[PDB]
Design a binder for this molecule. Structure first.
Ligand SMILES: Cc1cc2nc3c(=O)[nH]c(=O)nc-3n(C[C@H](O)[C@H](O)[C@H](O)COP(=O)(O)O)c2cc1C
Ligand SMILES: Cc1cc2nc3c(=O)[nH]c(=O)nc-3n(C[C@H](O)[C@H](O)[C@H](O)COP(=O)(O)O)c2cc1C
Lengths: 193, 193
């Protein structure tokens, strides 16, 4: 069955790709090559999204409210759903099997991407999970991470689209989410077709 | 008095600066050189934040929910507060005088930055402004724009910090905001001291 930990290679924090060109070419794509992302590309993508960029401080590529670091990245692959661990550049298995449909919700195109990243805010890290103000903070934090992903994909020539739509009942189950974890956004990612 | 329109130079969409290095060096800074940003730097910053990257389609560097393009960027300078117009790469005067304190709220350090960008979601472009779900969309959209700014600043060697705090009463007045416009975030920006 699925590996309980996928060890990804060290991210290449010096990878080619101009920011300004990444901004110019930043766009949503809803069609994907079928092939899996290389582990190099998946590693670099995850570090860009919300990796540790200052080791001694444990701080991240993505800012967060009060440095609470509330956004977790779940990685939904055909063989299983994993949770990104930035401290080890590794993925820890959450649930076996293919849960892309849960990410897709009503949009079938999403199942065509070889991987989806799901941005889930752990609202308890921010305050009262039932507070609208706390939710708005988590939402802001998710958008921050989303644009790291979109820009990385543009620089790296990967297809992606930021999405808010998903089947929350099936996704809660698939990602084994607590009631205080709120899925905010997701990103199907693949090579261009 | 203040120019009613500041015409900024065409943004240099091919400006030096690796994305991966921008990610590595991305961090919050709460101290600033006193000198004003060059108009070149302010132009490039605003285009990165939420410029038009596909002219024929009118689409932007920052994605938005349904392409509703809800995030407006107000630019708070010593001489006046302006609204960024992406279609003309220009700034249109909203209110004369220095309104940095309104952005600062309880944090006096903010008045030390020569410019602050205020990210205001026009919630009516998204739906019912009173809906929590609509607000969460606007918040996500603001975070997207925020991280464009943070990454640009890292690439360009500008100091910035994403903030949610501000004096909303004084800011509403200063930016002449409608009830359906919700300030979400702000970014003091300057050169490093
Ligand atoms: C949504 C959001 C709201 C924030 N609000 C404030 C704020 O009001 N004032 C401030 O000084 N910093 C604010 N911060 C900056 C965080 O404190 C900062 O991101 C955090 O300490 C991590 O530091 P880093 O950005 O260097 O990684 C905010 C950050 C985010 C993402
Ligand atoms: C917060 C947010 C939510 C979105 N939700 C969806 C979605 O559920 N499904 C989808 O196909 N696109 C979604 N989009 C993508 C937008 O439709 C897209 O950004 C917009 O059409 C502009 O296109 P562009 O990204 O190429 O600039 C979302 C975008 C954002 C920022």
């Amino acid at each position: 069955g699925a590996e309980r930990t996928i060890q990804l290679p060290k991210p290449d924090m010096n990878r080619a790709g101009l920011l300004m060109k990444a901004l110019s070419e930043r766009h949503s794509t809803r069609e994907y090559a079928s092939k899996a992302l290389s582990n190099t590309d998946l590693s670099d993508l995850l570090w860009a999204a919300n990796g540790i960029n200052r080791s001694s401080e444990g701080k991240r590529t993505a800012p967060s409210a009060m440095n609470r670091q509330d956004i977790d990245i779940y990685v939904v692959l055909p063989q299983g759903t994993y949770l990104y661990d930035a401290k080890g550049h590794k993925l820890n298995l959450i649930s076996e099997g293919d849960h892309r449909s849960a990410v897709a919700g009503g949009q079938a195109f999403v199942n065509n991407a070889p991987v989806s990243l799901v941005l889930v805010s752990d609202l308890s890290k921010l305050g009262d999970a039932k507070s609208n103000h706390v939710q708005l903070m988590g939402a802001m934090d998710a958008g921050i991470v989303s644009q790291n992903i979109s820009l990385f994909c543009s620089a790296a020539r990967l297809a992606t689209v930021p999405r808010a739509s998903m089947d929350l009942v099936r996704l809660k189950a698939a990602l084994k989410l607590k009631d205080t974890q709120m899925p905010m956004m997701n990103h199907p990612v693949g090579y261009f077709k």
